[PDB]
Design a protein around this ligand. Structure first.
Ligand SMILES: Nc1ncnc2c1ncn2[C@@H]1O[C@H](CSCC[C@H](N)C(=O)O)[C@@H](O)[C@H]1O
Ligand SMILES: Nc1ncnc2c1ncn2[C@@H]1O[C@H](CSCC[C@H](N)C(=O)O)[C@@H](O)[C@H]1O
Ligand SMILES: O=[N+]([O-])c1ccc(O)c(Cl)c1
Ligand SMILES: O=[N+]([O-])c1ccc(O)c(Cl)c1
Ligand SMILES: O=[N+]([O-])c1ccc(O)c(Cl)c1
Ligand SMILES: O=[N+]([O-])c1ccc(O)c(Cl)c1
Ligand SMILES: O=[N+]([O-])c1ccc(O)c(Cl)c1
Ligand SMILES: O=[N+]([O-])c1ccc(O)c(Cl)c1
Ligand SMILES: O=[N+]([O-])c1ccc(O)c(Cl)c1
Ligand SMILES: O=[N+]([O-])c1ccc(O)c(Cl)c1
Ligand SMILES: O=[N+]([O-])c1ccc(O)c(Cl)c1
Ligand SMILES: O=[N+]([O-])c1ccc(O)c(Cl)c1
Ligand SMILES: O=[N+]([O-])c1ccc(O)c(Cl)c1
Ligand SMILES: O=[N+]([O-])c1ccc(O)c(Cl)c1
Lengths: 342, 342
C-alpha cells in the first residue's frame, strides 16, 4: 500500500510517548546505571526502584526507537545514540531531558500549545502557577539548573562571541541579564583593561559572584542585583544582551533595548548575541525548537534578520553590523549584532 | 564532528514540541482549511481565530518537519505526509491526534510517565480527576469520540476476525465489552443462525442499540448494560473479548477470563482479539505505542505470546489455538486466540 510510509512518518512525528520515554530514561539515569553494570531489567529496577515489568515496557520502546539494544538475552546496552544520555557526555543531553531540571520541566508547557497559538501568550504559568522567571525565583534549585544548562557549552556561550569583538576602545562593559557572568569573564580575560558589570536577578547574582570569585575576577567584574526594565545602574561603552531579548515580546524587547540605548557612552555599542536567521532560512529545527520554547515558556520569540532591522529602529538604534560567528563546536548558526544610536 | 548525526537523532526523538505541533495542527484542522483554500498565514489565522504571528511560528515547524511546504511566497500546502491530516482521510489520523478527542486527550497522561514506571499504575486520574472509563462515563462526548476512533477501520476491527472463525456450531454469542456492537454485527451477517448479545457500559449501549437498529439487526443482536466483573448475563457457545483484556492488569484480566469461563456452554470457546507478539518480536513501535498507552491510561498491558499461555492457565483455560489474522489494510499483526476449558 502506497501511503504506509507517509502514515508511519506522521505517526512517529505525532507520537507523544516517544519523547516522554526518552525524558523518562534521562530522568531515571538509566543509561548511567547500565554503563555502571546494571544490564538486566531486574538489576536496573533495583537501581532505580521501579517496578520490573513496567521498566521492561519502557526499555522495550527504548530498543524500538534505537536508544538501547538487547546485547545478550535479557541484557541491554546503549546504542551510539543512547550513549549520549550518559550524564557526563559533553552535549549534556541527559540534563536537558531531565524532567526534574528546569527546561524539560518547562517543556510540559507544550501540552497547551493550542492556547499559545490562539493568544500568543505563554502557558507555563497555567501549569506551574507563576510565570517562568518568578517560578525560578521561588525555586533556587530550578534557577541553578537553568543557569547550568544554558552554559553547558562555554565555547559557544562565552568564548566565541568574546573573541569576535574588538575591545580596544572599550573601557566599561555592562552585561545585561548576564547569567553567571561567563560572558563578562571571557571578555575580561581577553581584554585586561576592561572593567565589567553583570546585571542580574536575585539568586543568580550569588552564583555569578561565586563564579567570578573562583575565577579571580572579583576586582574587574562586579555583580549588581537589578531589573533591566528600570534605568541601568551605570553607563558603558559596550552593553551585552546575550540570549536576553528572545525571552520577551516585541514591546518588552524595545523597552530593554531603549534602556540600553539610554546607558550608552558616546561611541558605545549594544551587542546582541542570538540567532538571526533570514526568514527564508528559518524553517529549520534549531530555529523552531528555541522559538517555540520562547512562545510557551515566556511569550518571547526568536527574531529573523528582517525583524532585527525593525526592532533596532523602534529603540532609536541602527544595526551597524551583523557578525556571523564561527561554530567552534556543533553547527549552530549564531550571530553578534552590533547596534548603534540612530 | 562524528557524533552530530547521533545528537540530532536523540534530540528529535526527545522533542516534546514536535508531537504537540502535529496535534495542534490536527486540533486546529489546519490541513482541512488549507485544502479549502486558505493558504496564507493571514487567511488561516482568520479561519482558526489564531494570532497571525503565532500561527506562522507553528507553520514554520510544520514545514521544518515536512508536513507543510511553502509553495509560493507566503503560501503553504500539505506534503504527502501532511495530507494525512485531512479530516476524511481513511487513516483518521486527524481525529487520533485531536486534543479534544478522547485518545490525544488521554495521551497527556504520558507527561507523568516516570510515575507509571515506578508504580505500574495509570496517571490519567492524576491529570483528569477520574480513572479512564469513569471519566468517559461522565463525559458522553468523549465516550462517543473514543467509540468512533477504535472502530475507524471496520475491516480490522470487525470483518477480519468474524471471517476467521467457523460459526457453524455456534448458536449464541456473547460479546463482552463489545463497543458499538460492530463485531457482533459482523458475525450476525456471516452466520444468520446466530443470536448475539453485546454486554457494555452505560452510554455505549445506546450507541450500540442505535447502530444495530440502523443495521436491521435488533432482532438478532441485543444489547445489555452491565459489568463484566459480575456474573455474565447469560451463557454462550462463543464469548468474545475483543481489545478488552489489554485494558486490565493481570489480576483483573484473570477475573474477566474466569467470568467468561463460567458462562461457557459445553464445547464453547473464548475468542480473544488482540496483539500477541512473541516477546522477541515485540520490540516494535506498534506494540510499544499501544502497550504504553495501556500503562498510563489504565494500568493495563499488551500480552506477548508467552504471557497468554500463562494467563489462560490461571483462569482454568487452555489456549486451543492462535489464529494469525490476515492484514486486509495496513500491516498490523493481530490474532484471534481461541481458549477452551482446561
Ligand atoms: N527583569 C530582569 N532584570 C534583570 N535580569 C533579568 C530580568 N528578567 C530576566 N532576567 C535574566 O535574564 C537572563 C536570560 S538567560 C541569559 C543568560 C546569559 N546572558 C547567557 O547568554 O548565557 C536570566 O539569567 C534572567 O535571570
Ligand atoms: N466493567 C465493565 N463492564 C462492561 N464493559 C466494560 C467494563 N469496563 C470497560 N468496559 C468496556 O470495555 C470496552 C473496551 S474497548 C473494546 C471495544 C470493542 N470490543 C472493539 O473491539 O472495538 C469499552 O467499550 C468499555 O465500555
Ligand atoms: O506504522 N506504524 O509504525 C504504526 C505505529 C503505531 C500504530 O498504531 C499504527 Cl496503526 C502504525
Ligand atoms: O544539544 N545541545 O543543546 C548542544 C549545545 C551545544 C553543544 O556543543 C552540544 Cl554538543 C549540544
Ligand atoms: O529551553 N531553552 O532552550 C531555553 C533557552 C534559553 C532560555 O532563555 C530559556 Cl528560558 C529556555
Ligand atoms: O538552543 N539552546 O537553548 C541552546 C543552548 C545552549 C547552547 O550552547 C546551544 Cl548551541 C543552544
Ligand atoms: O540558545 N539559547 O537561548 C542560549 C542561551 C544562553 C546561552 O549561553 C546560549 Cl549558548 C544559548
Ligand atoms: O588570537 N587571540 O589572542 C585569541 C585570544 C582568545 C581567543 O578566544 C581566540 Cl579564538 C584568539
Ligand atoms: O541538531 N539539531 O537538529 C539540533 C536541534 C536543536 C538544538 O537545540 C540543537 Cl543544539 C541541535
Ligand atoms: O493509524 N491507524 O490507527 C490506522 C489504523 C487502521 C488503518 O487501516 C489505518 Cl490506514 C490507520
Ligand atoms: O489509544 N488507544 O490506541 C487505545 C486503544 C484501545 C483502548 O482500549 C484504549 Cl483505552 C486506548
Ligand atoms: O493501536 N490501535 O489503538 C489501533 C486502533 C484501531 C485500529 O484499527 C488499529 Cl489497526 C490499531
Ligand atoms: O488496538 N486496539 O486496542 C483496538 C481496539 C479496538 C478495535 O476495534 C481495534 Cl481494531 C483495535
Ligand atoms: O467466503 N465468504 O463467504 C466470505 C464471507 C465474508 C467474508 O468477510 C469473507 Cl472474507 C468471505
Amino acid at each position: 500500500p502506497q501511503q504506509i510510509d507517509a502514515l508511519r512518518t506522521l505517526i512517529r512525528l505525532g507520537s507523544l510517548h516517544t519523547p516522554m520515554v526518552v525524558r523518562t530514561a534521562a530522568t531515571l539515569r538509566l543509561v548511567d546505571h547500565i554503563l555502571a553494570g546494571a544490564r538486566t531489567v531486574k538489576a536496573l529496577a533495583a537501581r532505580t526502584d521501579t517496578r520490573p515489568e513496567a521498566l521492561l515496557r519502557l526499555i522495550r520502546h527504548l530498543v524500538a526507537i534505537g536508544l538501547l539494544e538487547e546485547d545478550a538475552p535479557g541484557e541491554f546496552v546503549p546504542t551510539e545514540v543512547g550513549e549520549l544520555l550518559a550524564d557526563d557526555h559533553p552535549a549534556a543531553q541527559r540534563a536537558w531531558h531531565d524532567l526534574t531540571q528546569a527546561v524539560a520541566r518547562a517543556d510540559i508547557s507544550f501540552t497547551r500549545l493550542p492556547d499559545a497559538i490562539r493568544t500568543g501568550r505563554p502557558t507555563y504559568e497555567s501549569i506551574y502557577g507563576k510565570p517562568f522567571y518568578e517560578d525560578l525565583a521561588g525555586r533556587p534549585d530550578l534557577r541553578a539548573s537553568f543557569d547550568s544548562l544554558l552554559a553547558c557549552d562555554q565555547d559557544v556561550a562565552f568564548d566565541a562571541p568574546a573573541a569576535a569583538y574588538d575591545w580596544t576602545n572599550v573601557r566599561h562593559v555592562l552585561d545585561v541579564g548576564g547569567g553567571k557572568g561567563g560572558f563578562a569573564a571571557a571578555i575580561a580575560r581577553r581584554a585586561p583593561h576592561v572593567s565589567a558589570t553583570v546585571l542580574e536577578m536575585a539568586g543568580t547574582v550569588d552564583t555569578a559572584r561565586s563564579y567570578l570569585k573562583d575565577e579571580g575576577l572579583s576586582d574587574r567584574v562586579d555583580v549588581v542585583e537589578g531589573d533591566f526594565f528600570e534605568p541601568l545602574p551605570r553607563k558603558a561603552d559596550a552593553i551585552i544582551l546575550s540570549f536576553v531579548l528572545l525571552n520577551w515580546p516585541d514591546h518588552d524587547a524595545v523597552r530593554i533595548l531603549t534602556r540600553c540605548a539610554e546607558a550608552l557612552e558616546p561611541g558605545g555599542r549594544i551587542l546582541i548575541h542570538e540567532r538571526d536567521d533570514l526568514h527564508e532560512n528559518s524553517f529549520n529545527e534549531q530555529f523552531t525548537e528555541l522559538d517555540l520554547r520562547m512562545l510557551v515558556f515566556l511569550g518571547g520569540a526568536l527574531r529573523t534578520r528582517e525583524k532585527w532591522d525593525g526592532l533596532a529602529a523602534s529603540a532609536g538604534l541602527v544595526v551597524e553590523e551583523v557578525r556571523q560567528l564561527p561554530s567552534p563546536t556543533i553547527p549552530y548558526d549564531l550571530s553578534l549584532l552590533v547596534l548603534a544610536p540612530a
